[PDB]
Structure formats: C-alpha cells, structure tokens
Design a binder for this molecule. Structure first.
Ligand code: ZN
Ligand code: ZN
Ligand code: ZN
Lengths: 205, 205, 205
C-alpha cells in the first residue's frame, strides 16, 4: 500500500497512520507515510512523497494541493531520551507541528517544504522552490526556483524566481504582491482547478 | 495502471488516453496521464510524471527522452466556459499544444518543462533545469540548473549552469553553441544512447 | 519488481543485478536498476531512482542514505567498440566506478549525483543539491541548492546554499567547516537517525 504507518524507532514508540479526509484524492503513485493529517479536497499528485517518520505531525490544510514530485519531510522533533527538540518544532494557533501547510496552499511541481516549517494560507510555493527552517506568511508567492531558509517571510510578499533568501534582513525587504504583479492571481486559479481535479480523479477510483 | 486517462472536469468534457508509439518504452514506475502523444523510440524513465489533465495536448517527438523525475504539466488551456485561454497555448507548425517537445530532445534527470512551452529539436534540457512560459529553439543547451521563464531562446544558444533567464533582453544576448563548447555534442550522445536503451528495456518487458 | 537488472545494449553485453546488503532497506516505491552495490544499513527512500545502465558500477557505501526523489545515474563509461571512456570513470582506492558514494554519506531529498562523480565519507549532500563531473572530499557539506560541476571540493569545506561552483579556483577558496558552523553536525545526526529508520522499516516488511 502507498498509504502506510511509520515504523517503531527510539524516537517513535507508537506507529501512526495518516488521517486523510474522505474528500481528498491521493494518487496511487504518491507515497504518504506516518503521522500526517490531510484536509478536505486536497489533491496529492504522482511521485509526491509525504513522510512523517521522525516525530510530530505534518499537516496539510483544506483545499491545498501537493503536486508531482513534491517532498514533505522533517528533522527529528523528539530525541532518543524522549526530550522534545524545540528548535525543530513550529507552533501554529497553539498547536505544535513538524511541518504546517495552511489552507488553499499550492505546493507546485518538484518543490519541497522541509520541517521545521510553516506555510500560511493562500500561498503559492512555486515549481522547484524550497522552504526549510522558515515561516512563510499568508498570501505569499515563492516564484519558481526561489528558496527561503532560516527566515520569516512577511504576509503578502513574493520572492523573485531563483532568489535564495537566507537572512532576515533580506526577507524583511522583499517586494509586495500587488494586483498588477504577474503571479498575483496564480494561486487562486491553481487552487480552483485542483479542487476540481481532485473530485474528477476521485470519480475514476 | 501507470498509463491512464485524465478525469472529467468542467475544463474537460471527454477523457483522453495517451497515444504511445509501439516503439516507445514507458517504465512501469513512470506515470503518463491524459492527452499525451509520445513518439517513436522515446524512453520514459522511472519516476517521470507526464500529466495532461488541464486541456490541450502534451506532445513528445520522436527519439526524445524523458529522464528520471522529470515533470511535464501545463496551465489550463480552456476555461470553464469553454473559451480557449490563448496565453496558455503554444503554436507549432500550425497546431496548438500545451507543451510541445520536439524530436531528438533530451529532458535530463529532474528537469521540468511546464506549459505553455515549446522545446525545439536537438536541444538538451539539463539536469534540474526548468522551462516555463518559454519557447526554446533548436540546437540549444540548457546547462544543469539553468532556467528560462517567459522568454524565447534563439536557436543554437546555451544557458550557463545556474543562470535563471527571465527577460528577453538577457535571452537575446546568450552565448552561441560552438564546436569547442563543452556541451556541444552532449545531446547527440545522450539521444543515441537512449534510443538504444529504449530498445533494450523493451526486450525485458 | 522495483529491483531490476539492466538491459542488454551495445555498451552492455551482460545484464547485472543489484548487490544489496541484507541490512539495507529499499522502499517499495524506490527504483534500483543494474550494476549497483548498496552497503550495510543503507536507507533508500520513496521515489529515489538509482539507475546503472550505461556501464560501470554505482557504489553506495555503508550507513549512507538516499532520500526521497534522489537520482543517481552516470554517463556512458564504455563506448560501442568496447573501449572504456576514461573521462567518465572515477578511481577510488584502486577501483573504477561510474559513481562512488562513500560511507556515512547523506544524499538529501531531491538531490542528484550524476557520474562521473565521487563523494567522500561523512559528507552531507543537501536538499536539491547537484554534483556532476566532480569529486567531493570527506567531511564536506553541500548546503541546500548548492552545486559542484567539474571540480574537486577539498576535504572539510562547505558550499553555501544556492552557490553553483564550476571552476577549480572557486572550489579552492570555499570556506571550512568549523564547530560553530550551522551544518557542522547535521550529517552525523542524519546518519544516526537513518540507520535507525532503516532497521525500523525492515521490521515492517
Ligand atoms: Zn528530511
Ligand atoms: Zn502544473
Ligand atoms: Zn544520466
């Protein structure tokens, strides 16, 4: 099966199985392992790997999409001695996660979000982009091949294609999404299409 | 099955199944979905995802290769009201495509060509490279980790490794492939080898 | 089966099957083809593709890990006339390889090491990184999205995130890993965790 529990390890005494909303579509050629929650109307495409086997949940909110070849994984959040590694945990609305992906988020083809990380609602994570040890705000756009490592990206900003942002001073001066910006409506269009694709693929299973 | 029709959606009233030349080899661990035409002697490697589920064909010409982890997909080409979205369609020799990959093209490991896009004959798209909203001419080389977004790359030019080209003014001044250039013969060698690999893999199926 | 022989080709008269230590874990959704040797306690994750079908071995040393979406492949090492192509072969401790990955090496998610290439022991190859026609020394760190093409990286150096190193003069001046460097202990932690994950996954098969 391609939806599987994580294994018993010294960091993980009890296996967990994914919790997947019945309206989500998981492609048979995707892999989803371990302590993962997938929300309503989410589409998970071929060759995506969502793997939560080092402690703490990976959460994917409602109406989000995880496109072909995307990887979600996280650094260990509990060491062998049972002690939580706080640097590797993100907090969102009072709850702790290894990776938090909000609602209406698009993780486009071949991107990767590696914990600890949080991605706020209505954000587009572009093709081949990379997010690690970062909090990306709501209504952001990471253009293709951009990256955010070790930073907080404020709400409503974009990272131009190819730019690798590693310092908070850079992140603070990113440009704002405006109506005339080329990707200002991209996420809404991609979310709308993927919610409908998920329903269509569900009707073929 | 890993060769599948696309689903019924408001953008797609009729499912299409891939049209695959009998001399092509599709690895069992690749995925090919929807309105896709694959030409003669094409090799499609493990973990590639070719997904045409938003309207309009993805075409892969003869003696081309789609290597491991490559993704081909396209933006919607027909909106819900049945109206063709012309910005998201490319025209090649009088016919419309979402993605057109010409003959003798190598899409090397982990690259991605996302529609609307066209790639001309005898072009090497290097490892981890990215092409989106662009027309790449014939006899071009995209070195590893290069990208072309929103531009036309003239025939016979190369993009140096890691360079992300987003403006026509940059694309117009790219260097020319010459006989002494390090990748001048790379594509021909890779095509020759892959045509023979496709035949060898076909003999094991 | 996902562990397979390579095909007969003019460059390869005799098919080879992978040699895999009994303590290694190969995920059912990984692909391993051809002349590959995998050492003890190695973990190969979903969607990785290790493909040795153009001559010469791909070797992965003990306690190394090949994470999700990683690709290992190599340029042809024997031409049709049976003549070895020496430029495409690396030598390590008196033996020839297409790709050599040493012991305790982490190939992190979505990275790629393409032959000819060698990666020395205790080196971290970061997420989405790329190594081609290069020798990476021991105790190195390639940060996420870095690349080494056509160079030798001296022992104990790191490449900052996003940097693409293509000239020996650049490689010679890379910074040194020190105890205070942010990734100085990353590989040891990742190796330790993955050796335990491999054992846990083996207990579920
Ligand atoms: Zn990881
Ligand atoms: Zn797409
Ligand atoms: Zn290759």
């Amino acid at each position: 099966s391609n939806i599987r529990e994580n294994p018993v390890t010294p960091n993980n005494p009890e296996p967990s199985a994914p919790v997947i909303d019945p309206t989500a579509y998981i492609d048979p050629q995707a892999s989803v392992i371990g302590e993962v929650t997938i929300g309503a109307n989410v589409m998970v495409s071929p060759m995506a790997s969502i793997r939560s086997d080092e402690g703490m949940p990976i959460f994917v909110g409602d109406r989000s999409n995880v496109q072909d070849g995307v990887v979600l994984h996280a650094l260990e959040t509990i060491n062998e001695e049972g002690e939580p590694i706080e640097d590797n945990i993100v907090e969102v609305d009072g709850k702790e996660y290894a990776v938090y992906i909000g609602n209406n988020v698009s993780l486009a083809h071949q991107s990767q979000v590696h914990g600890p990380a949080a991605v706020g609602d209505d954000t587009f994570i572009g093709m081949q982009a990379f997010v690690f040890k970062s909090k990306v705000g709501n209504n952001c756009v990471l253009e293709p091949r951009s990256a955010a490592i070790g930073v907080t990206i404020p709400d409503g900003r974009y990272i131009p294609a190819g730019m690798v942002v590693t310092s908070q001073a850079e992140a603070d001066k990113l440009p704002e999404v405006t109506d005339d910006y080329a990707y200002s409506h991209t996420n809404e269009a991609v979310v709308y299409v993927n919610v409908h694709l998920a329903e269509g693929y569900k009707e073929t299973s």
